[PDB]
Amino acid sequence: MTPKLKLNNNINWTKRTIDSLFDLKKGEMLEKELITPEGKYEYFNGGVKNSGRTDKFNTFKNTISVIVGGSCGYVRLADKNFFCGQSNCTLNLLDPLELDLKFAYYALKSQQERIEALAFGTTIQNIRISDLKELEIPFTSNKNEQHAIANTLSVFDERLENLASLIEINRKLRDEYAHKLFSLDEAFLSHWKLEALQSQMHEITLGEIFNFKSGKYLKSEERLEEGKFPYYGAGIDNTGFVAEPNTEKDTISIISNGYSLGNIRYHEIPWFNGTGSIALEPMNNEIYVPFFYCALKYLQKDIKERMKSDDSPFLSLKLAGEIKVPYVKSFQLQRKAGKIVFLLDQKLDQYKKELSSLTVIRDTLLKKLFPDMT
Numbered sequence: 106m107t108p109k110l111k112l113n114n115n116i117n118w119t120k121r122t123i124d125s126l127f128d129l130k131k132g133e134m135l136e137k138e139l140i141t142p143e144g145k146y147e148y149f150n151g152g153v154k155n156s157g158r159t160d161k162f163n164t165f166k167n168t169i170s171v172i173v174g175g176s177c178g179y180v181r182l183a184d185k186n187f188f189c190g191q192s193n194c195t196l197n198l199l200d201p202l203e204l205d206l207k208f209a210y211y212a213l214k215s216q217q218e219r220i221e222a223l224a225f226g227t228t229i230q231n232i233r234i235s236d237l238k239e240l241e242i243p244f245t246s247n248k249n250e251q252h253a254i255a256n257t258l259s260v261f262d263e264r265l266e267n268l269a270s271l272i273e274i275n276r277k278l279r280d281e282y283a284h285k286l287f288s289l290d291e292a293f294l295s296h297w298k299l300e301a302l303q304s305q306m307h308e309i310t311l312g313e314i315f316n317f318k319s320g321k322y323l324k325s326e327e328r329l330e331e332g333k334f335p336y337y338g339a340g341i342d343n344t345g346f347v348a349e350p351n352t353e354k355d356t357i358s359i360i361s362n363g364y365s366l367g368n369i370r371y372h373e374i375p376w377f378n379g380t381g382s383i384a385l386e387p388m389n390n391e392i393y394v395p396f397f398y399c400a401l402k403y404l405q406k407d408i409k410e411r412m413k414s415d416d417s418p419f420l421s422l423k424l425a426g427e428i429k430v431p432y433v434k435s436f437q438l439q440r441k442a443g444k445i446v447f448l449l450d451q452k453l454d455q456y457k458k459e460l461s462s463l464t465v466i467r468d469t470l471l472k473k474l475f476p477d478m479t
């Protein structure tokens with residue numbers, strides 16, 4: 106009973122049954138006519154996600170639950186009032202003074218695989234309540250240590266929650282801005298001082314403002330897994346790294362092959378253009394590349410959909426050169442328009458990177474902070 110990450114010295118860790126720490130109650134049957142997509146509360150039954158919404162609740166926020174039918178073993182700490190269903194079980198603290206709520210949640214959460222293992226069946230899975238009660242979890246009666254561990258794993262959880270909320274806010278605003286931009290919404294052009302676009306914006310083909318190169322190809326013996334300069338080749342993200350980049354920063358690429366065909370990205374750093382990839386290099390300095398990136402992202406679904414009804418093939422340099430995008434000649438005006446959308450893209454990109462990074466860190470710390478019982 107020694108955690109791999111120790112916050113304090115000489116902590117006495119012990120095993121405790123769920124029965125010795127919690128009061129267990131299964132949820133209730135929610136009648137179908139009480140389920141409405143516009144309902145105030147979540148219906149948490151057998152899923153990790155809700156099984157619907159309602160205007161009824163039977164469980165206050167800040168109650169721990171464990172799924173005992175369906176996605177068995179899953180541990181939740183609800184931050185909103187909710188409707189607990191029959192495949193879900195609440196675990197109420199027997200003594201709040203011996204045991205911190207948030208610590209209790211993490212102690213249970215760290216043993217999630219061992220709770221899952223209690224289930225019978227695979228396709229239809231159930232946990233018996235009497236088995237759940239008998240499961241031992243790691244415990245310490247040191248309150249300072251309970252708070253230290255709960256504090257460490259809350260800051261992660263609260264940031265992830267806030268990040269998810271930020272991504273969703275900024276995804277919708279970004280979509281709105283792009284749509285109002287490229288359709289030239291009058292009220293939007295007024296507010297953002299882009300009235301000049303009304304007269305000046307027209308269609309150009311990509312081949313008139315960019316030059317194209319298809320991706321080059323490197324053997325596994327010519328790649329690194331950690332490097333400075335990313336290799337890009339047919340997945341949306343880098344397949345490893347490179348010694349010498351072959352393409353400059355401030356460039357666009359489009360995947361030409363496979364299932365990620367027609368996906369567009371902007372390059373902030375020098376990179377390697379690999380086999381299922383096309384690079385776009387602006388023909389002169391008067392091109393604000395991120396304007397065009399935004400324009401292509403706006404059209405990305407349309408391009409994919411067109412490539413589908415093409416042959417089911419690849420995107421050639423010929424076809425890519427033919428892509429029509431909105432265009433204004435003025436550099437200052439490309440930047441002024443483009444920046445409104447593109448600053449949200451960059452914000453969203455950092456948020457998604459941080460969310461992905463902290464998810465991994467949070468999983469790592471949760472495992473290391475509690476004694477291993479397998």
Ligand SMILES: [Cl-]
Binds near residue numbers: 226227229230
């Ligand atoms: Cl089954």
Ligand SMILES: [Cl-]
Binds near residue numbers: 405406
């Ligand atoms: Cl798409």
